[PDB]
Design a protein around this ligand. Structure first.
Ligand SMILES: CONC(=O)COc1ccc(C)cc1OC
Ligand SMILES: CONC(=O)COc1ccc(C)cc1OC
Lengths: 300, 237
């Protein structure tokens, strides 16, 4: 188990850790989070009490270094930093633990939610989507735009997701216009899977990362990317059987996790109705269709 | 974006543009089979591609063999239309390629956009106008060339005959659409109007009779009366 200590909590803030949230009050004696499961990526994230504008946060993996949070009163935010002095860090953490100044990641032992939402997410891939190579952790926020959003503005602060555009020359072979636009298997299998992602695990990892950014930060470009990557699969007549089974599982846990109150803005009605009821794969997502129909029958 | 009554004069500016109408691309007769079921027999069709400024009509005849062994023909027809329009553009010298293509039905937008991805500066647009271009097969000489074709073929016409010698393209187009509207609403009456007077003939190199300005005014009035007439007969007014 690992720890993210906090120097202090000088401003009142909603703290998100993965799918969990809790409230810290202005100048409360809070010195961080402990018992963080080793083995997964994680995201710590914030929503200032006094300005719910700009949720922001950090993707990290505790195996990749010793990280802490420190409020920066000039920039006005909780910043992640790396402590390189290992013995300083262990000493700091041990004291905060002895004084019980840390809340504990309260993973239920029956609970595989976080694993199921991050199964294919790798820190190394996150770091290529979020370019800031002097840190081992990755900052994201509500307002960051995607490479594709900028084509349609600061390139350093962008989300470099893989560009998907069904009416592009990359997506459409000369001479197979109608075939490739109505059945996108070439684009999925040859262009994206074999060409860009190399395998379906990296593809699913981006899809999962896009949803999480979309739900945690209300990042609109992330929501577009998630829906695009779902639609590309559902609109392909030819998809490996194991990808469809995995995709059903991935979407099921994303919908299950999706808070009921957040669904009107995170769920695209056109894409879901198309995917579940009209597309080639309309019969191949049983778990996802069952949970969607029982939880969000309004959207359908 | 879309083309409507507000920006109607854009049709006649100096930016090259083409209307594409796909309504006569895929044509069928429906008949009973010996077993008492129903079946379709396709007949030849045409893409109707018109420069509204010049009157140049690029009539791409669609021979029934292009449907042989194909499924979902109504959807294929839209992709075949787009393919043929894209090939037409590619065949034209750069300075003759359109800057805009306006499709008369919205279902044509995605097929044509996809076929024209190589031409990102050609704007593909819908229109809110209800143009009567489906009536083009009521023009005898265009109907004759489609039905006689034994293979795919492109025929080039000027749908305004020599009108631009005497009127603007705005007026020529307004005449064309009023003629086609009438032919669409009551073909027999419209043809009767157009041919009643045997002293006015259609030149061999024309589609419409050789009316003087004054006779066109009469004709145009009689077509308006026909359209109004049929409107009454239809709605009981
Ligand atoms: C505002 O509460 N604190 C947040 O950061 C909430 O944002 C989330 C949205 C949805 C879920 C399931 C969890 C979340 O993170 C905890
Ligand atoms: C089940 O746990 N209850 C929750 O959902 C939210 O409570 C917390 C969750 C996670 C952490 C680190 C701290 C928490 O409160 C201090």
């Amino acid at each position: 188990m690992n720890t993210v200590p906090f120097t202090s909590a000088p401003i009142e803030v909603t703290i998100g850790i993965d799918q969990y949230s809790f409230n810290v009050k202005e100048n409360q004696p809070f010195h961080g989070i402990k018992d963080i499961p080793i083995g997964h990526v994680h995201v710590i994230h914030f929503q200032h009490a006094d300005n719910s504008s700009m949720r922001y946060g950090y993707w990290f993996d505790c195996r990749m270094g010793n990280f802490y949070i420190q409020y920066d009163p000039k920039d006005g935010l909780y910043k992640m930093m790396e402590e390189r002095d290992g013995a300083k860090f262990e000493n700091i953490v041990h004291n905060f633990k002895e004084r019980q100044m840390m809340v504990s990641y309260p993973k239920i032992d029956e609970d595989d939610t976080w694993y199921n939402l991050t199964e294919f997410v790798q820190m190394d891939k996150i770091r290529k989507i979020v370019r800031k190579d002097e840190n081992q952790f990755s900052y994201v926020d509500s307002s960051m735009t995607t490479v594709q959003e900028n084509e349609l503005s600061d390139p350093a602060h962008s989300l470099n997701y893989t560009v998907i555009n069904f009416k592009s020359r990359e997506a459409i072979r000369p001479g197979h216009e109608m075939e490739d636009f109505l059945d996108k298997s070439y684009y999925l299998n040859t262009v994206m899977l074999q060409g860009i992602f190399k395998n379906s695990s990296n593809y699913f990892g981006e899809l999962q990362f896009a949803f999480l950014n979309a739900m945690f930060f209300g990042n609109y470009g992330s929501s577009l990317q998630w829906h695009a990557m779902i639609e590309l699969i559902c609109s392909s007549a030819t998809v490996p059987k194991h990808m469809l089974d995995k995709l059903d599982e991935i979407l099921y846990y994303q919908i299950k996790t999706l808070p009921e109150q957040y669904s009107d803005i995170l769920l695209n009605e056109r894409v879901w109705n198309i995917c579940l009821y009209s597309s080639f794969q309309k019969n191949s997502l049983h778990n996802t269709e069952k949970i969607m129909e029982n939880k969000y029958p309004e959207l359908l | 974006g879309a083309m409507n009554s507000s920006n109607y004069a854009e049709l006649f500016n100096n930016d090259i543009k083409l209307f594409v109408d796909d309504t006569n691309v895929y044509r069928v007769t429906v008949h009973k089979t010996f077993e008492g079921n129903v079946a379709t027999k396709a007949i030849n069709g045409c893409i109707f591609t018109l420069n509204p400024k010049t009157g140049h009509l690029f009539l791409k005849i669609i021979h029934t063999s292009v449907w042989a062994g194909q499924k979902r023909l109504s959807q294929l027809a839209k992709w075949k239309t787009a393919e043929e329009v894209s090939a037409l553009v590619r065949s034209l010298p750069k300075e003759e390629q359109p800057k805009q293509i306006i499709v008369t039905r919205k279902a044509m937008l995605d097929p044509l956009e996809v076929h024209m991805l190589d031409f990102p500066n050609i704007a593909i647009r819908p229109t809110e106008l209800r143009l009567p271009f489906s009536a083009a097969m009521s023009i005898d000489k265009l109907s004759d060339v489609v039905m006689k074709a034994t293979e795919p073929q492109m025929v080039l016409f000027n749908i305004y005959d020599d009108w631009l010698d005497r009127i603007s393209s705005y007026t020529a187009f307004s005449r064309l659409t009023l003629l086609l509207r009438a032919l669409k609403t009551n073909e027999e009456s419209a043809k009767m109007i157009l041919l009643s007077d045997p002293t006015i003939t259609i030149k061999s190199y024309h589609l419409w009779p050789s009316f003087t300005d004054e006779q066109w005014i009469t004709i145009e009035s009689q077509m308006r009366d026909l359209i109004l007439t049929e409107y009454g007969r239809k709605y009981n007014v």
